[PDB]
């Protein structure tokens, strides 16, 4: 399927144990997609002071369209030293590995895969 319904656990930035997906734009997009498929991907909502507490390159989920079955359609955009790889809509948050942190909420998304 071109899209997959996922429910992403929303994590508090200070709880995150693994603060990024790797060391290059291509690696972080690769690893983010793998963790999204495996159910091992978390979401941190972006506010003041959040991104400096996480590791670059960043992987964002961004709104790709204006929401089937409650699932916002999203796609992946990476960022490294202020340059983004991909073009999309509003950020829903930054993706991180999930390794058992307790979430505060869930974010239903339809991931363009």
UniProtKB/Swiss-Prot annotation:
Localization annotation: Host cytoplasm
Tell me the impact of changing residue 37 to R: In strain: Omicron/XBB.1.5, Omicron/EG.5.1
CoV Nsp1 globular domain boundaries: 2-113
Instruction: From the UniProt entry, list the residue stretches annotated as the region Disordered.
Output: 1-113
Role this protein plays: Inhibits host translation by associating with the open head conformation of the 40S subunit. The C-terminus binds to and obstructs ribosomal mRNA entry tunnel. Thereby inhibits antiviral response triggered by innate immunity or interferons. The nsp1-40S ribosome complex further induces an endonucleolytic cleavage near the 5'UTR of host mRNAs, targeting them for degradation. This inhibits the integrated stress response (ISR) in the infected cell by preventing EIF2S1/eIF2-alpha phosphorylation upstream of stress granule formation and depletes host G3BP1.
Q: What name does UniProt use for this protein? A: Host translation inhibitor nsp1
- Organism annotation: Severe acute respiratory syndrome coronavirus 2
Give the stretch of the parent protein shown, with its full length: 11 to 125 of 7096
């Amino acid at each position: 399927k071109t899209h997959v319904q996922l429910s992403l656990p929303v994590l508090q930035v200070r709880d995150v144990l693994v603060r990024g997906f790797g060391d290059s734009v291509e690696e972080v997009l690769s690893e983010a997609r793998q963790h999204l498929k495996d159910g091992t991907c978390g979401l941190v909502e972006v506010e003041k002071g959040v991104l400096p507490q996480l590791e670059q390159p960043y992987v964002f989920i961004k709104r790709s369209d204006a929401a089937p079955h409650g699932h916002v359609m999203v796609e992946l955009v990476a960022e490294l030293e202020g340059i983004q790889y991909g073009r999309s809509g509003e950020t829903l948050g930054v993706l991180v590995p999930h390794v058992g942190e307790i979430p505060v909420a869930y974010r239903k998304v339809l991931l363009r895969k």
